[PDB]
Design a protein around this nucleic acid. Structure first.
Ligand SMILES: [Mg+2]
Ligand SMILES: [Mg+2]
Ligand SMILES: [Mg+2]
Ligand SMILES: [Mg+2]
Ligand SMILES: [Mg+2]
Ligand SMILES: [Mg+2]
Ligand SMILES: [Mg+2]
Ligand SMILES: [Mg+2]
Ligand SMILES: [Mg+2]
Lengths: 99, 114, 127, 83, 152, 100
RNA sequence: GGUGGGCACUCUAAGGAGACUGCCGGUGACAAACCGGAGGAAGGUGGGGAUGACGUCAAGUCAUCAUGGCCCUUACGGCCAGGGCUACACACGUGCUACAAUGGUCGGUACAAAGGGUUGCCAAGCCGCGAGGUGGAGCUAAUCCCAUAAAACCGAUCGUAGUCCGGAUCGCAGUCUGCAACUCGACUGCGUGAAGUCGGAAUCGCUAGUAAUCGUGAAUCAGAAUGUCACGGUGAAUACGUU
């Protein structure tokens, strides 16, 4: 019984990673419960765009953090531990607990 | 009746008037010599008015307050201190604005030349 | 048994359960009167139920989260309307004409740059 | 005002220049640039020339104004008058 | 506007009395979005009216309103060379709002204990027409009559 | 945003980072109630004699690219305006213009 | 929901259907399109935001940066300590608090959204009227903390008096961070307690979750918001019309 957490700025890559890990874990016979989308974290910034005095001209920018949760039952094969380069490629962070 | 205290009012409400007692220490005085705050001061027996006089005379009121404030202020101007020096001009001493909006310490507008 | 409904209005949500009974009417495990204190919430809540003359025939058990008191009352009204029309699917036109099934859509407009409120502006001296 | 965990506050150089001035009595005004110094009661009777910004203004200290800072008695803005 | 496309949202939220005119009076008397305060004030005035007049306060309020509703009003017009005022009859809808506005405005400035008895006094006065609101309505009417030479 | 300004604020950074513990020790001594005036006054003198340019209050963080003091976002290391250039070029990861 | 448990619901977030003048009646050059109706959660670009054509004002910026020239080289380049940008006979712009009874206090009581946190949040108990102090749990955060929303409702009181309104100014003593609160910080305790009775000429914003009113968070930041950006609670009146 282990728990896996996934963090990413973009949702497409986190979805691809979740599908990949689900497929790898299911294909070996170990049971897996469905992913949990944790609430995203949105941070916003309002910035001046003029080099000098124009207070009303401003830009709004946003950074989004997406989190997914997975859990397994009946751990029998552990190959994804050696598949870290497969699981994470450029912009997805993976945490594992209760190994 | 203190220094001509008003009647037809709640005890503490009238007790705010003795110039040195506000509302918190007024309630402290009211509860020290236990009397009803909601009772009208007109319906107050004289057997506790003397105790209220003792409570008032314990600390200060009117004249003594004038003496102490004026002596405290007087030792500021003479000392050459900045606080007293500003206190001798009508300018505010805590450090508020003076380029504008210093009205309560300058009274009327007193326009230029007229 | 029972029937279920959901009502939302102005970031307030409410789950309603309509069962046979004598209308105990419990709001968040509390009585209807004990929740809304001296306001127009009671009758606006019971409006769909009193329109169908079925005030007591249906015991109502609800839970409401989010929003304010008026928003909660509107959410309960919508939810119990949905629960009712999940029992009496011939009075659809009745509550269309009553105007109780259409969900409210107005929401708090956001703040914009250069303005104080959603639409208020500074004074704009001409000189 | 400063928290009571630190009553006085004097620069070390000022202390060592005036702690000498207690064994031998007041004989010469002390030229000082520290306006943050807190005058203790046991230096009453000395002349201290505090830096105004252009020159050092000399002042004498007695017991009345012991509870005050050094530069508080040395102003920096002239204001000779509008008219 | 220039389109004539603006809708007319209908509000009828009388809690217990179930009156339409009462609801619009609520909307008129409400201040700073305080509905509950308006409810308490209007209902206190209504209860004072009941405890004073044996007649039911519904019809007393109605007859006070119908005795303060004007029929014609004077409106300025730019003729291009003079300052002229022409009398025009009231739209049937507008007179109700005019009566409500006049009643609440005159009730706001009595100087007595609270708006409960203020509105009570105004309703009793305008029930037969001894209130200041009726006097000012008559003054507006006599403006309109004294400016009848234009009429049109 | 002169060269000298950047160099001499790097000086503050270096001096503050170089001690980084003696300030904590002396403030622990001072803040602790049961320390006695004997062990408080020597700590006061130690704090006083130590150089003034080794304090957090003496540090003003500027842009790492130009050194502009005003308009700083500590989420990045950038100033008010180079953030816009980097975002538009697409160098800042996960950053997009928001409407909501 | 304290536990077993459930996948019912809400909720969270990904993928999708839905509204396209689609159908009916009337008009219209039997065109485009217009006026109502059904169904519909929503009907006529549903609501809001981002998106700013060719060009104009030799508009702003050489002080964010870059850059053609011209300028100083014992200084127009550097280092350090104090002072000023927070001064003050006056005038102007932009806001906050008020001038009270659709309220001021007192007691208990109800419901939100959004967000920040490991050089951080910083709880419990205990000590202080208080600002605060010891202490250390838990949290790399849908879990722990910031942190108890307020206006609203009820009950008691004040009775329109410059007042149980209003809070500037001022005196005394404090608390917190910072090497250091005098010039020149913010809050706390006691007391004094001002102008202010809704404001001329003139002038401003706003068409529906809008105006009005009540609270909450973030950035900058050792400390310093009545400013900026953002989030919700309650919730209007009016539009005959285009001279
Ligand atoms: Mg919003
Ligand atoms: Mg709002
Ligand atoms: Mg103007
Ligand atoms: Mg350069
Ligand atoms: Mg700083
Ligand atoms: Mg030009
Ligand atoms: Mg220029
Ligand atoms: Mg300035
Ligand atoms: Mg418009």
């Amino acid at each position: 019984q282990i728990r896996i957490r996934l963090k990413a700025f973009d949702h497409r890559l986190i979805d691809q990673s979740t599908q990949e890990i689900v497929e790898t874990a299911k294909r070996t016979g170990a049971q897996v419960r469905g992913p949990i989308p944790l609430p995203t974290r949105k941070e916003r910034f309002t910035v001046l765009i003029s080099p000098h005095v124009n207070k009303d001209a401003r830009d709004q920018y946003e950074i989004r953090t997406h989190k997914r949760v997975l859990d397994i039952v009946q751990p029998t094969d552990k190959t994804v531990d050696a598949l870290m380069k497969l699981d994470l490629a450029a912009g997805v962070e993976v945490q594992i607990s209760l190994g | 009746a203190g220094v001509n205290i008003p009647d037809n009012k709640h005890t503490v409400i009238s007790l705010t008037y003795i110039y040195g007692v506000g509302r918190t220490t007024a309630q402290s005085i009211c509860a020290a010599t236990g009397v009803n705050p909601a009772a009208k001061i007109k319906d107050l027996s004289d057997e506790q008015i003397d105790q209220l006089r003792n409570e008032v005379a314990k600390i200060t009121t009117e004249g003594d307050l004038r003496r102490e404030i004026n002596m405290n202020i007087k030792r500021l101007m003479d000392l050459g201190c900045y606080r007293g020096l500003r206190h001798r001009r009508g300018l505010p001493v805590r450090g508020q604005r003076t380029k504008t909006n210093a009205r309560t310490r300058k009274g009327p507008r007193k326009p230029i030349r007229k | 048994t029972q029937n279920y409904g959901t009502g939302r209005r102005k970031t307030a949500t409410a789950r309603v359960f309509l069962r046979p009974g004598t209308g105990k009417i419990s709001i968040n495990n509390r009585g209807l009167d004990q929740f809304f204190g001296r306001e127009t919430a009671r009758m606006v809540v019971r409006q769909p139920l009193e329109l169908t003359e079925t005030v007591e025939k249906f015991d109502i058990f609800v839970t409401v989260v989010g929003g304010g008191v008026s928003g909660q009352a509107g959410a309960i009204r919508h939810g119990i309307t949905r629960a009712l029309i999940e029992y009496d699917e011939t009075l659809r036109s009745s509550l269309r004409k009553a105007g109780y099934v259409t969900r409210d859509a107005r929401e708090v407009e956001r703040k914009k740059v250069g303005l104080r409120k959603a639409r208020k502006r500074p004074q704009y001296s001409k000189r | 005002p400063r928290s009571l965990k630190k009553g006085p506050f004097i620069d070390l150089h000022l202390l060592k220049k005036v702690e000498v001035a207690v064994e031998k009595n007041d004989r010469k005004p002390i030229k000082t640039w520290s306006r943050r110094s807190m005058i203790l009661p046991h230096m009453v009777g000395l002349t201290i020339a505090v830096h105004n910004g252009r020159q050092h203004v000399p002042v004498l200290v007695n017991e009345d104004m012991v509870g005050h800072k050094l530069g508080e008695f040395a102003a920096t803005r002239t204001y000779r008058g509008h008219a | 506007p220039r389109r004539r496309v603006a809708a007319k949202r209908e509000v009828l939220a009388d809690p217990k009395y179930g009156s339409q005119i009462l609801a619009k009076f609520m909307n008129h008397v409400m201040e700073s979005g305080k509905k509950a305060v308006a409810e308490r004030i209007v209902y206190g005035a209504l209860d004072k009216v009941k405890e004073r007049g044996k007649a039911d306060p519904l019809e007393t309020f109605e007859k006070a309103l119908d005795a303060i509703a004007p029929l014609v009003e004077v409106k300025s017009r730019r003729v291009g060379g003079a300052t002229y005022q022409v009398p025009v009859e009231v739209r049937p809808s507008r007179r109700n709002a005019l009566a409500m506005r006049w009643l609440v405005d005159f009730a706001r400035k009595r100087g007595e204990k609270s708006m409960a008895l203020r509105l009570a006094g105004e309703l009793l006065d305008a029930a037969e027409g001894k209130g200041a609101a009726v006097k000012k309505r008559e003054d507006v009417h006599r403006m309109a009559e004294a400016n009848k030479a234009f009429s049109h | 945003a002169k060269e000298s300004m950047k160099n001499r604020e790097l000086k503050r950074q270096l001096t503050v980072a170089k001690y980084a513990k003696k300030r904590a020790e002396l403030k622990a001594i001072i803040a602790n109630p049961n320390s006695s005036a004997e062990e408080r006054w020597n700590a006061q003198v130690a704090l006083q004699k130590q150089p003034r340019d080794a304090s957090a209050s003496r540090l003003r963080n500027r842009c790492r690219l130009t050194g502009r003091p005003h308009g700083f976002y500590r989420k990045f290391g950038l100033s008010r305006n180079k953030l816009r250039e980097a975002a538009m070029r697409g160098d800042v990861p996960g950053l997009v213009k928001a409407s909501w």
